[PDB]
Amino acid sequence: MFLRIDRLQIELPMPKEQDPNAAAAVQALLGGRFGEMSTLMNYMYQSFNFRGKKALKPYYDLIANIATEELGHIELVAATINSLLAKNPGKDLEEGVDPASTPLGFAKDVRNAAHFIAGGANSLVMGAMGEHWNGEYVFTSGNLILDLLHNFFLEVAARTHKLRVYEMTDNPVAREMIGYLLVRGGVHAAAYGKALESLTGVEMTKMLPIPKIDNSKIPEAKKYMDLGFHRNLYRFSPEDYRDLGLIWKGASPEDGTEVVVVDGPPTGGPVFDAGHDAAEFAPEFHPGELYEIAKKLYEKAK
Amino acid sequence: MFLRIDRLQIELPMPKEQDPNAAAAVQALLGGRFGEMSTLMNYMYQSFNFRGKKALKPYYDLIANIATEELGHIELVAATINSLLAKNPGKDLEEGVDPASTPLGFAKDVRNAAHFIAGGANSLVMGAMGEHWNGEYVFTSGNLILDLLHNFFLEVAARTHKLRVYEMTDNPVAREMIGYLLVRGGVHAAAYGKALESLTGVEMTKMLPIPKIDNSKIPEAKKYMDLGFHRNLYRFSPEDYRDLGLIWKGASPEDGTEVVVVDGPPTGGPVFDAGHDAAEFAPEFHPGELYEIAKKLYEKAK
Amino acid sequence: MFLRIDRLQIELPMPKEQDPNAAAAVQALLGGRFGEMSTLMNYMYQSFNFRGKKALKPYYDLIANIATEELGHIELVAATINSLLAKNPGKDLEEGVDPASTPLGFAKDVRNAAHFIAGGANSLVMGAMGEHWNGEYVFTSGNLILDLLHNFFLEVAARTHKLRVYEMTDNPVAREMIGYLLVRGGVHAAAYGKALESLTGVEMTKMLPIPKIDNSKIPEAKKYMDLGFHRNLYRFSPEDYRDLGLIWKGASPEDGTEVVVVDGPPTGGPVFDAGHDAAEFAPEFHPGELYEIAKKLYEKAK
Amino acid sequence: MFLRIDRLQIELPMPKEQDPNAAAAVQALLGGRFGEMSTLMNYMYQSFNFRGKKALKPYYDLIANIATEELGHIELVAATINSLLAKNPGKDLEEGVDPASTPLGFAKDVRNAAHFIAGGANSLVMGAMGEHWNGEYVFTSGNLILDLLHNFFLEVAARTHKLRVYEMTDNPVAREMIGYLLVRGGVHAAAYGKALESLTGVEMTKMLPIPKIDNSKIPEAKKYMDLGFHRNLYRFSPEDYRDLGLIWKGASPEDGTEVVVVDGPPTGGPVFDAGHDAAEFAPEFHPGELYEIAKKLYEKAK
Amino acid sequence: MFLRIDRLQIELPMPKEQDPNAAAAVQALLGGRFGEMSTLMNYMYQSFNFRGKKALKPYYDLIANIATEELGHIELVAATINSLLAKNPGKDLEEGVDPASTPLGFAKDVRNAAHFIAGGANSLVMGAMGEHWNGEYVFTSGNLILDLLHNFFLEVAARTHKLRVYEMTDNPVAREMIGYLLVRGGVHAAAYGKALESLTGVEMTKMLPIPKIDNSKIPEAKKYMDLGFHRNLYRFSPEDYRDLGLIWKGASPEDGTEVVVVDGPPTGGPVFDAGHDAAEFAPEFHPGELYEIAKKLYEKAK
Amino acid sequence: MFLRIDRLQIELPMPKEQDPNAAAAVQALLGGRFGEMSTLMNYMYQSFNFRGKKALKPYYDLIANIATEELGHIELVAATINSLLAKNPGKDLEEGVDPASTPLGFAKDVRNAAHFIAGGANSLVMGAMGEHWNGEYVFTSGNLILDLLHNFFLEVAARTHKLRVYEMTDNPVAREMIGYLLVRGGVHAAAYGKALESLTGVEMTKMLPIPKIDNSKIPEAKKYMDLGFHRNLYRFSPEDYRDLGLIWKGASPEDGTEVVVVDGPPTGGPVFDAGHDAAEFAPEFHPGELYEIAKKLYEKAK
Ligand SMILES: [Cl-]
Ligand SMILES: [Cl-]
Ligand SMILES: [Cl-]
Ligand SMILES: [Cl-]
Ligand SMILES: [Cl-]
Ligand SMILES: [Cl-]
Ligand SMILES: [Cl-]
Ligand SMILES: [Cl-]
Ligand SMILES: [Cl-]
Ligand SMILES: [Cl-]
Ligand SMILES: [Cl-]
Ligand SMILES: [Cl-]
Ligand SMILES: [Li+]
Ligand SMILES: [Li+]
Ligand SMILES: [Li+]
Ligand SMILES: [Mn+2]
Ligand SMILES: [Mn+2]
Ligand SMILES: [Mn+2]
Ligand SMILES: [Mn+2]
Ligand SMILES: [Mn+2]
Ligand SMILES: [Mn+2]
Ligand SMILES: [Mn+2]
Ligand SMILES: [Mn+2]
Ligand SMILES: [Mn+2]
Ligand SMILES: [Mn+2]
Ligand SMILES: [Mn+2]
Ligand SMILES: [Mn+2]
């Protein structure tokens, strides 16, 4: 079972301008083959399907726990896309929009028109070409070593996509998210590499980084390394998965320093609200009446 | 962000033997169009994309919280499938399997061979025809009423699929899971119906049940209603989503009794471990050496 | 624009009992690559997209009119599938079905479980592997000769699929439908071949039949030829497409006899009603109340 | 069976300029998830699959008839796209096009290159991202109420997409089509809502409009309401489906006035011909010789 | 079995500038429905599946051999795309690229972002809309005449796409490849047409060209015809498939001159190397260390 | 460019009778995600897209050459499937088949009906669920180490699928093919592992085998190892790719013995001809006339 905390994993900056094509590129990191939906669903299904949940417990704890972290990463990437698509971020009401004035005219010419037609200027479950995420992006073979080898690869392929998208947009909201997730993905790659070394004797972490560029060269990633976050494997569970430190120990690939398990999630930051976009009818064309209904739900004695 | 608890939402019984074609049918309820992946991802993305998270908070709390519950439902359905596919449930080591003796010969003739080739006799992210789940199964328009109308439909369409699969499968593991999720889906349909009543004045809950068959006609569902589970909307969060009772109040469609918000998740039941399947090389062909590696990790613990 | 007549293009017989796997095979002829959806949508879109609707009118009339005929062919193939899937054909109310008794147990083991889960034991928009029909099965290039060459091929490929499914299914409903549509597909291939002869001088009809087997070897098709149906190109329009005989003239490939344009549709046969299937909740679990509602609508008629 | 009338459902204006990206957006309304292909094929297959064609006749008449109207809507949307893609609308011959001069250079940079490569600058069976329409967009459950609930949703989701595309392009051909189809979709939503109220007692039409914006705010829709077309359910059949008025009666959601059944289709307007586009080889590179062949087919004595 | 020669089928010119959208259009010719992947895989699988490899040997030789030629065409089209995507063609090392400087900023706005995210600025197995090539683009019916009819169509549909893409870009690398492959596709269409005439008596080559525009009107195609290459069917085999001349004989459709079989491949040209693209991390971010490792592999005594 | 040799990489035995479901399982090894189409197309596109073809030549030679070997593997797997689907292997003419007698009745009930409808009882470009192979199964990042890591994984994932299908199918044709390709896949995994060791210092070959089962436990694979085939990397080229031994050297993972580069392809075995299947109209319904046409082509030879 799962619980939810109404917080993003980190604070994101306020966007300052809508940037559709940046949002379309960032979609690769959400619903593309190596996006966060893929790391999430790979680890989630491997955790469901895991044989030897007690006999191979440290490895089960690892996959079950990292799957849980990736839930917050789909959330964070979706918030980033929503930030880039928001017309009036954080504002409950805009007035004066007339459909006949062609208020979505710009959207005719952007790469991803679906953001504005199917979505209400919001994230979709798709990649940078509009391709919807598909369950064949999941590998769940039942063989622990084969799955871990796949997962090591998956994290460094995902990192490669994050780096390339970083190089496509200088939007600060996108770069903040990417910097943080480069650091988290470095932790995951390192953790799967340590798990493989424990099972096989092959020193997989010595292959890192892939590609051969250090996170310290990406300013927004270095920001988070400077706070120590490359050392931390957070245990996203009240009472379970307590044996992570049997694998998550020893040296960090980033700097050689000792890594640690942190019990519980990080503090986080607030969730994002894109505000009213009347041309998208989101959350309604003129939402004042609905806001009044919600207000009155609280005004009650019962 | 999210947290994980290593418990299924209910306990499941143990099948007498593998039932591949039952597993293949139950896949519809996991990765098909109206499976638990779809309800999960619809509500998850709607919750990310929600505009007016404070101004429309009671409705945000509802979608965000039900999304969290559906995480445990993909888990529960996967456990059911895994139970039906497990050769040696709960048994860590089998001996004597010879690949040269065609130990997977039965799988040549089952509906879903992928369970045994791509999977290690485990669940996959697909429906009852082998169709992989796809992101176009998600509807996230940004318009609250349109989304809620969709979600009401989604729950009763999902219910219809659960009922039909129930009528195909006599296996207790499937009947228990389905009976439970018929009751939970009744709660979700009722909740979305109450939300639509509040926003629109249209008495959506009066349309229930769809199809026009009572959950009381399904023995396992009747048991869960006798335990009160049709009344309960669990708050799957440490501290958030405390306004569910503004919508989740009044009469149950099942029996007219007053519905309730329950603080926290249910206690549930143990997770499922399919054990060793040597022919599937899952978790390894001969896993004793890996079990020894894991044991030694604890000896070297700090 | 289009009009509808509540008649199948031929009458169909009644199966003795349900035959799921026959239905699954016949799906190839509905939603597969060379099924009736494909011939329909190819000619429909070509007719929309046709350039030179007046200057090339005889050819426009041909494509526009054959497209209309193919609408009735998707209808006829769907009726055949529905006939094979119907538990109680023609019977409005069945009693005593208990969902708890696994009344759909047989469906666990059939090829196409979707017929019974997604469908209410009814046709779906898919082929013989469960693959849903897709718009990339349409070829609409705008070049008349290229399109007609494609359409000649499409008809003989579709014929080949019909012949192979005929050889799989002994059910009279399927044999009657297929025999009829072998004759109609012979007309369409001949018509496109005559159109290509007129435009190019290449004697395309001399290539027929493809494969090199005569429709006379298929008993149901032989009967329809004995009724003259290989000669007939029906004008499926009140007043339009009156120049079909400019192309549809001269010898039939089947027997050398003169072909004819028939004003209007054939008289055909009754549409099919699969009746009540309570386990499928179709049209309702217990439909008597809805039947009463419908009866009362007539009492309140103006 | 079906008949065809060689007329669009309404007169469309002459385009005045090619607008590829407008055509790409309008594709959402043709082959996207909530485009006219989807409403068409949903109602068509539900009509084939309908159980109780006599016992539930008014409801059968409704679905069978609206399916037939949607055939003319795929035609109308395709004509709109073709208008936007036409280089020389209504002109049989253009001269002087040289392939080596890069006459399709603009198409390199438009969103939808397929319009110009796969199509001969014509409509395709796809949405606004190039996604081809797929049969999984059809819902045909066999349960009347569940299908009608789906269809109500489908019409208002389709309306939402039409409104958003309207707001993306000010092209008069697109806006004329959209205005008309907003009015027709309002009729369909109202009709399915009335059918649901008759079966369930739930006042579904009181939820309209969705989104909460009136068609009267869209000038091209108000044009058609001012002619009375929101009141009219046309019976697209010579002799069948005569019981529509048992459901289609009472108040219009638009203005409270009494709705009516109209026997037969509206008058319509001419079909559209995009003319010669030599660079697309459509209908031929230099079509004069083919036009002469067609002319000579008429010059005959026989 | 197969052998490889490290040469393109022709010399291509050096690109001079990156042209992403030209590369995206040329993708239609690689991984689209009528691209070189399709002609390749159609003929390859037909050759595997061929019945009567001795009894119908000349026809087997034809399909087996043309399949082999198409391997070099996927190679040639991929080289063309890679040329259009190359930043530093032929250069092993570039220095001074900083990811934080947004070196891929242009790629945010191009049609095909996947070239830069999934690919390292390189070709992908997809068409001009980003659609990945799929095995349903292959037709392998087992019936020789039906397959040959399909293949005739396939070549002229492929030619039509090549012509349209030619008209979209004036890039010399693209136009050189297209000119050559127009000539080769003319040979293939002619060869399948001759095979059909031999089997059926229908003069299929008299339909050529389709569309009705001569290759001699395309300067880069005329270049290769002026060298005689429209006459040549190369036998891509050391010792097999020696009976091609039983079919490949008689007049060329281009000019009426006698065609010939050439034993062995043409001379070819060098392969293409896109060079270092540091922002794509291709072949590495800073490849000097890897180049030194490779150099040292040669410095050996053993 | 490529050349073709009309030989399979090994000889195959003849099945006693058709085995449709065995063929359907073996399809996973052809067109599934980890089938031979995937290894082929991964290495083919990586070889096209390779940057530093001279500076990193030993690695280019390896990928380019292994790609060529995989061409013969799609051929070999297709031959295996065709063998399992052949009614009359090696027999040019069968008499007496009557389509009216349901000669394909068995095919109604097999897993893969497409083999008999779309195919003429022959292989298709799909996996074990009927899923067509797709280009998103290719990973071509441009980064050498990332690609090689992927390829190492791909080979062991493909091996895992081969092992599982082996365990499903007792047919000698399948066991021989799979035993051989287990040995060849061991060579490829070892080669990519050696390449990674050279570039990274990580001892990837020490992870082998994956899964942890020796090829010696599979009797057919053991025979091929006893013949030395695990040592051999064949140079599938007349004159190119002469630096394979710079990487392909040192110890075999199977037995510690020195590996070798073999100049040229193996001698292999005959290609397979499925013979006449009249019910499939393959190569024709009654092929005697076409056989006579072919005979006469030789009489008219030059
Ligand atoms: Cl990740
Ligand atoms: Cl991560
Ligand atoms: Cl649900
Ligand atoms: Cl639920
Ligand atoms: Cl047809
Ligand atoms: Cl037909
Ligand atoms: Cl509609
Ligand atoms: Cl409408
Ligand atoms: Cl080609
Ligand atoms: Cl070619
Ligand atoms: Cl392989
Ligand atoms: Cl291999
Ligand atoms: Li069982
Ligand atoms: Li039967
Ligand atoms: Li057998
Ligand atoms: Mn992540
Ligand atoms: Mn990760
Ligand atoms: Mn659920
Ligand atoms: Mn639910
Ligand atoms: Mn037809
Ligand atoms: Mn037809
Ligand atoms: Mn419509
Ligand atoms: Mn409608
Ligand atoms: Mn080619
Ligand atoms: Mn070709
Ligand atoms: Mn291989
Ligand atoms: Mn391999």
Short mmCIF file of N, CA and C in Angstrom, two decimals, chain E residues 50 52-64 195 243-247, chain F residues 293-295 297-298:
data_model
loop_
_atom_site.label_atom_id
_atom_site.label_comp_id
_atom_site.label_asym_id
_atom_site.label_seq_id
_atom_site.Cartn_x
_atom_site.Cartn_y
_atom_site.Cartn_z
N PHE E 50 9.50 -18.10 -48.99
CA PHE E 50 9.21 -18.45 -50.36
C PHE E 50 9.04 -19.95 -50.49
N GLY E 52 8.70 -23.07 -53.17
CA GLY E 52 9.14 -23.33 -54.52
C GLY E 52 10.46 -22.62 -54.87
N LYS E 53 11.41 -22.65 -53.92
CA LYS E 53 12.69 -21.99 -54.13
C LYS E 53 13.47 -22.57 -55.32
N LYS E 54 13.21 -23.84 -55.64
CA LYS E 54 13.79 -24.45 -56.85
C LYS E 54 12.78 -24.46 -58.00
N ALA E 55 11.53 -24.82 -57.75
CA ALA E 55 10.54 -24.95 -58.82
C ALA E 55 10.18 -23.61 -59.45
N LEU E 56 10.29 -22.52 -58.67
CA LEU E 56 10.04 -21.16 -59.10
C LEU E 56 11.31 -20.32 -58.93
N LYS E 57 12.46 -20.94 -59.19
CA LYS E 57 13.74 -20.34 -58.88
C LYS E 57 13.97 -18.96 -59.43
N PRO E 58 13.63 -18.64 -60.70
CA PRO E 58 13.98 -17.27 -61.16
C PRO E 58 13.31 -16.20 -60.28
N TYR E 59 12.08 -16.49 -59.82
CA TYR E 59 11.34 -15.56 -59.00
C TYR E 59 11.91 -15.45 -57.59
N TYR E 60 12.36 -16.60 -57.05
CA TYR E 60 13.08 -16.62 -55.77
C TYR E 60 14.35 -15.81 -55.86
N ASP E 61 15.15 -16.06 -56.91
CA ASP E 61 16.40 -15.30 -57.10
C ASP E 61 16.09 -13.81 -57.07
N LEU E 62 15.03 -13.40 -57.78
CA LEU E 62 14.69 -11.99 -57.89
C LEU E 62 14.41 -11.37 -56.51
N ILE E 63 13.52 -12.00 -55.76
CA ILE E 63 13.13 -11.43 -54.46
C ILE E 63 14.29 -11.49 -53.48
N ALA E 64 15.02 -12.62 -53.44
CA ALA E 64 16.13 -12.75 -52.53
C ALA E 64 17.21 -11.69 -52.80
N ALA E 195 8.27 -9.63 -63.91
CA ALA E 195 7.94 -10.90 -63.30
C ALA E 195 6.42 -11.13 -63.42
N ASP E 243 20.06 -16.78 -61.88
CA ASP E 243 19.06 -16.85 -62.93
C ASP E 243 18.22 -15.56 -63.04
N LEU E 244 18.76 -14.43 -62.57
CA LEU E 244 18.02 -13.18 -62.65
C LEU E 244 17.68 -12.78 -64.07
N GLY E 245 18.57 -13.09 -65.02
CA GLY E 245 18.38 -12.66 -66.39
C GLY E 245 17.24 -13.34 -67.10
N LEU E 246 16.63 -14.37 -66.50
CA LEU E 246 15.47 -14.98 -67.08
C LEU E 246 14.25 -14.07 -67.01
N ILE E 247 14.24 -13.15 -66.03
CA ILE E 247 13.22 -12.15 -65.84
C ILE E 247 13.72 -10.78 -66.22
N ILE F 293 5.65 -22.43 -66.44
CA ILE F 293 6.13 -21.12 -66.89
C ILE F 293 7.61 -20.99 -66.54
N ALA F 294 7.97 -21.33 -65.29
CA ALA F 294 9.36 -21.20 -64.86
C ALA F 294 10.27 -22.09 -65.70
N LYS F 295 9.83 -23.33 -65.93
CA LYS F 295 10.63 -24.25 -66.77
C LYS F 295 10.88 -23.63 -68.14
N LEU F 297 11.06 -20.55 -68.98
CA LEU F 297 11.99 -19.41 -68.94
C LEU F 297 13.41 -19.86 -69.23
N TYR F 298 13.75 -21.07 -68.75
CA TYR F 298 15.09 -21.63 -68.93
C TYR F 298 15.27 -22.04 -70.37
#
